[PDB]
Design an enzyme around this catalytic site. Structure first.
Site, PDB file in Angstrom:
ATOM      1  N   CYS A  28       9.744   9.191 -23.946  1.00 28.77           N
ATOM      2  CA  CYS A  28       9.654   8.202 -25.008  1.00 28.77           C
ATOM      3  C   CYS A  28       8.210   8.134 -25.509  1.00 28.77           C
ATOM      4  CB  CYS A  28      10.250   6.853 -24.582  1.00 28.77           C
ATOM      5  SG  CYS A  28      10.964   5.898 -25.896  1.00 28.77           S
ATOM      6  N   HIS A  38      15.727   7.673 -22.874  1.00 27.35           N
ATOM      7  CA  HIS A  38      15.547   7.375 -21.434  1.00 27.35           C
ATOM      8  C   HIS A  38      16.610   8.120 -20.637  1.00 27.35           C
ATOM      9  CE1 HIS A  38      12.474   4.034 -21.490  1.00 27.35           C
ATOM     10  NE2 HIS A  38      12.612   4.382 -22.771  1.00 27.35           N
ATOM     11  N   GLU A  51      16.959   8.136 -17.564  1.00 29.43           N
ATOM     12  CA  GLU A  51      17.171   7.307 -16.348  1.00 29.43           C
ATOM     13  C   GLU A  51      17.893   5.996 -16.693  1.00 29.43           C
ATOM     14  OE1 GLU A  51      14.555   6.969 -18.240  1.00 29.43           O
ATOM     15  OE2 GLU A  51      14.190   4.805 -18.094  1.00 29.43           O
TER      16      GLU A  51
END
Ligand SMILES: N[C@@H](Cc1c[nH]c2ccccc12)C(=O)O
Ligand SMILES: N[C@@H](Cc1c[nH]c2ccccc12)C(=O)O
Ligand SMILES: [Cl-]
Ligand SMILES: [Mg+2]
Ligand SMILES: [Mg+2]
Ligand SMILES: [Mg+2]
Lengths: 659, 652
Positions: free
Chosen positions: B75, B160, B162
């Site tokens: 990001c 993201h 995750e």
């Protein structure tokens, strides 16, 4: 704290490095590989928390008999366990080498969460035919061969298949389950004697409060005002009259813990509260009674205020007018089991005294048997106001400006979600118990509480689980985020419920909190243990529809229950993401303390268990006035008017109670 | 050694989720450092990879620009802005909201479906990427979702991995780990200049052998006699006539490496063979030429004999009549690209010198061009098996009894067959390659022996990037006399429990071998129980892949996996002892490995099966099969006779 250390004993078969990969992926740590013929005495067995015995005399035997550590036997290791405890390892009905069996099981221990059946590869001609009394089978092949076993006492597990084989399913899950069993074992590894008495009556909980506890003095009532299989089951009540009871308060600004003893003496100490709580829970450790169906074996009951953020990840920006923490050390408690229709009485004596615990047991039991006898606010009415005598810190125009400031901060990439809150104050002559009796009728919830403390009364109608922590180290958080008002009709109501479950905006508000709570738990939980078994479940309470997600973890070894709460405090569901920058934005815009509101309320057990709610839908009673917080998530998609209306709606249960 | 990952915390609430995903994906938790750490005091040299967490951020900027380490920017992780790219407002701010992400399946996106679901937390996106940056992934609203620098080991994801609402996050972190390993392996002075000439002609391979290689001298022909897209594409031919060329043999008994140089003199050295080979390949390191579509950038061509097991996990139970290793150090080679219909000529000079590499390239290009105009693209009557039928049946009985006592799960029992022959190497190989076209055919004409391989089996293919593939074959059927018979036998091979068990146990064994030298999480099986059809038999074949750990040499990988699980069985050490007892003699070249070790660090090695060894007017060929608890004695013997057909037909 630290990561778990696994010993992988190589028995010189062609499987050790596959088990190495599977342990590494499952636990996020490579195991230390040692050959079976190594010197036991030399070996630093002290440094290790769990042993995996690979297939293929030697240290395998020592590990199982002498180590006292959790052991997983894989195949020849499994046979090792069966044999070492006087079992029969004879020929299976069919030699099975590199061949696949359907394995059926009870879903216990190493089989937790696995479907029955599941596919597994076998590499043996020998099976655990006659199991000793000390061992019990957990799993069987379609062939009728024992595939899983455990020792009834000792942390010893066997599998008669290769979890790590390419033809096996859920190999990593079996290794993760063993890691979790190893963590639970080391947590399980006292100044008090806990006395317990079951009473086969269930009086009305409000009758117990009024009948068993004093009107005047410090008391708690953890109130499952809504009872629902799997959501809530128990209520807890006590007072400060006991000879070992203490009342503890904390002031962030002074940084001092004031403890009022059963003696009468108030002790003062300049230190952080979570550090203080951690010390005391270590010192006062008492194991859970196996005849109790709950894990609260006495301990601390009370609240952690928002301003404690100053000693977590936040700043000491504002001073609460209330204690930043307030707890009763409950030496004596009444537990209501709403499912089984009985009560449990818990009382502490010091290890070498008869401090009248047994006397309190028999008297309270006699008192309890004598006590045993037998809304929905839709919009726009729900969004009327804060009540006729009520003043919000921020009026509508003030709050619209803070929402505007929130949208600017989000647009400049400072926050992804800001839980902006208001604080409403209304003069009332109401005393705590009658007011609470009205609140609990208005809004039955799983995490209701009435705390009656010297400096304040807390009247909570919270439905929100912050942290439930087992003595075994299991952690659950159920962050609530995404709110819809109830409908003025049952048509409009089923509609608004569907709308909440399906709207992108509310799902996004909730998802960002799930990621935030995952992050907090990952800082104190074992690698691979943090997961989300449930996303965007809708729960309906009397005043509102709520979007709820479930996050679970398992504490790292060395991580205390107190350390877990500190890492996750204040709750992500009351701050937003990222937490540090967002809490700074909240400091600027709210221009004052949250106090008890947006904190946590519940119990820390001497077993190391905890159950904490988020303080929302709560009235703080102090000095002739009611204080209640309301708020909601500000995100890029937020409408200013709609967000304000949501805060008024969330006030309705409290406004109705005070009316 | 394991890979060390630095996770730079940019004071956001994502770092410990990234920590979890890196830990599970790589089997090692990253070291977490806050973005306001002291760069001078931070030991960046001790780390192999940097993950820049989302979020002035000093350590992050210097991670991407100052340090020459692999970087994954998550990001906020900068790469766009830092290299003269634009950061503009996305069509809609996306915080905690899912996008469908479509991609090229490259680098961090390797093996991910397109689309896959990813959660975004950003209002700003890369709009105008400079020449140096390349987009890899795009959202369903046309925003760049992934990028890389065209030279530097820098990857960015604008989502993201995750996040709970993202898919394939662990796969992305593992892909980054693999790229980090690849980068460091390609950093690891050169005593040679590599010269490359492409000639846009493709002559008949057998005419290149006859035309460009000497009759009596020591030569190699790595012969893709079968050419199939993604399976086989290149042939390699060379001789020992170059000035930097060496011939190289090993004896287990003596433990002696014998090196015959261009001089004609022979040097002798006492050193474990794999240690010597690892030493030479390190010292003789040359980077791959990107214009080459193959990985062999010259190096050693030859065979590792079965008895080399004495220096892996085996015992020296029997002495081979042949060298235990034999390699030509090829300083000059002809590569045929059967796909693009061109030839590549490779030649070494000494660094800064002219040993006539350009002259050979120029001369050989002319020869190839004129050659391409003329030529464009039971056991036998005098054969004697070491074990007669009755003897082999009782050896199978002994195998079953060892399997009954749980000493082995699968024993690859083999026989050695010998026959006098008038046939010379090239004509007999000409017969063999017509009989059985295969991806790993070879004719090695060395002083001590000629090796005529019709092997279809990939032992180890190792990239310069440290990517490993093994394709163990186990499970055989004879060919049918009709198309419909072949369909029945292919179906039968794939479906039988016995064959699936035979194969699966070798897959588990080879996974175990690769896991000893490969990064945690890197070892996987992309194909299980695939049926491949060749002229002589149907074969059940499974594919295993991994990534080499940092500090593991290619030679060390071969040592760890040798001899091939597909020719021994499980467990390998005990099973090889049983083989020692029952076979009563050496396997020699048979059941070893035949192929090349490149100066780049790459390698490509076949299993020696369906091979004739020629020495002393004598033909030698090994045949065997899996013995398991389900094995029938008569059928297992007949399988050895079936597997001899190609060699027996060629000798006949
Ligand atoms: N609902 C909890 C008990 C409880 C009621 N109110 C609470 C407030 C805080 C913590 C726990 C509680 C249970 O069933 O066990
Ligand atoms: N098939 C290989 C080249 C090759 C042919 N025969 C071989 C024998 C051993 C090693 C490699 C080979 C390729 O296309 O690249
Ligand atoms: Cl997850
Ligand atoms: Mg599987
Ligand atoms: Mg909102
Ligand atoms: Mg997912």
């Amino acid at each position: 704290g630290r990561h778990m250390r696994t010993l992988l004993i190589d028995n010189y078969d062609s499987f050790t490095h596959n088990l190495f990969q599977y342990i590494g992926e499952a636990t996020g740590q490579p195991p230390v590989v040692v050959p079976n013929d190594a010197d036991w005495s030399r070996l630093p067995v002290e440094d290790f928390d769990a042993i995996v015995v690979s297939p293929g005399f030697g240290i395998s035997r020592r590990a199982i008999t002498d180590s006292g550590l959790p052991v997983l036997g894989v195949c020849l290791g499994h046979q090792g366990i069966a044999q070492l405890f006087g079992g029969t390892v004879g020929l299976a009905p069919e030699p099975m080498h590199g061949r696949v069996s359907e394995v059926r099981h009870t879903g216990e221990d190493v089989f937790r969460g696995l479907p029955s059946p599941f596919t597994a590869v076998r590499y043996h001609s020998l099976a655990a035919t006659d199991l000793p009394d000390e061992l019990e089978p957990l799993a069987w092949s379609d062939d009728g061969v024992v595939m899983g076993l455990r020792h009834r006492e000792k942390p010893l597990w066997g599998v008669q298949f290769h979890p790590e084989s390419i033809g096996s399913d859920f190999g990593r899950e079996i290794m993760a389950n063993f890691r979790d069993l190893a963590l639970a074992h080391h947590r399980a590894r006292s100044p008090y004697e806990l006395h317990v008495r079951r009473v086969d009556v269930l009086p009305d909980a409000e009758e117990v409060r009024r009948g068993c506890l004093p009107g005047e003095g410090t008391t708690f009532w953890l109130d499952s005002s809504s009872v629902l299989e799997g959501a809530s089951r128990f209520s807890f009540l006590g007072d400060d009259r006991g000879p070992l009871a203490e009342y503890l308060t904390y002031r962030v600004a002074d940084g001092v813990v004031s403890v009022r003893g059963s003696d009468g003496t108030t002790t003062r100490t300049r230190r952080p509260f979570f550090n203080y709580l951690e010390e005391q829970l270590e010192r006062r450790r008492v194991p859970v009674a196996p005849e109790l169906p709950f894990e609260f074996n006495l301990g601390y009951v009370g609240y952690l205020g928002y301003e404690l953020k100053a000693e977590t990840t936040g700043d000491p920006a504002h001073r609460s007018p209330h204690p930043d923490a307030a707890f009763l050390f409950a030496d004596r408690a009444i537990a209501l089991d709403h499912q089984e229709g009985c009560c449990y009485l818990l009382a502490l004596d010091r290890r070498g005294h008869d401090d009248g615990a047994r006397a309190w047991l028999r008297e309270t039991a006699e008192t309890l048997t004598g006590l045993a006898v037998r809304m929905v606010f839709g919009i726009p009415e729900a969004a009327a106001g804060f009540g006729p005598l009520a003043r919000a810190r921020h009026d509508k125009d003030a709050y619209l400006k803070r929402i505007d400031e929130c949208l600017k901060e989000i647009r400049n990439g400072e926050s992804y979600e800001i839980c902006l809150t208001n604080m409403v104050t209304a003069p009332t002559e109401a005393t705590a118990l009658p007011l609470y009796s009205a609140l609990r009728a208005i809004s039955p919830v799983p995490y209701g509480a009435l705390l009656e403390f010297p400096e304040l009364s807390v009247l909570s109608a919270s439905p929100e689980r912050f942290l439930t922590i087992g003595a075994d180290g299991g952690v659950e958080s159920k962050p609530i985020k995404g709110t819809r008002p109830r409908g003025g009709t049952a048509e409009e109501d089923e509609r608004l419920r569907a709308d909440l479950a399906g709207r992108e905006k509310d799902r996004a508000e909730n998802l960002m909190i799930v990621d935030l709570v995952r992050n907090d738990l990952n800082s104190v939980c074992a690698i691979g243990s943090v997961h989300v078994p449930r996303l965007f479940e809708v729960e309906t309470y009397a005043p509102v529809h709520q979007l709820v997600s479930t996050i679970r973890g398992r504490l790292r070894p060395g991580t205390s229950t107190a350390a877990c709460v500190r890492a996750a405090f204040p709750g992500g569901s009351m701050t937003g993401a990222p937490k540090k920058r967002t809490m700074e934005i909240i400091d600027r815009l709210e221009e004052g303390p949250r106090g008890v509101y947006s904190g946590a309320l519940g119990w820390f057990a001497l077993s190391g268990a905890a159950d904490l709610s988020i303080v929302i839908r709560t009235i703080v009673l102090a000095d002739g006035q009611a204080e209640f917080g309301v708020g909601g998530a500000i995100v890029s998609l937020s409408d200013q008017e709609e967000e304000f209306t949501e805060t008024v709606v969330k006030a309705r249960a409290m406004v109705t109670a005070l009316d």
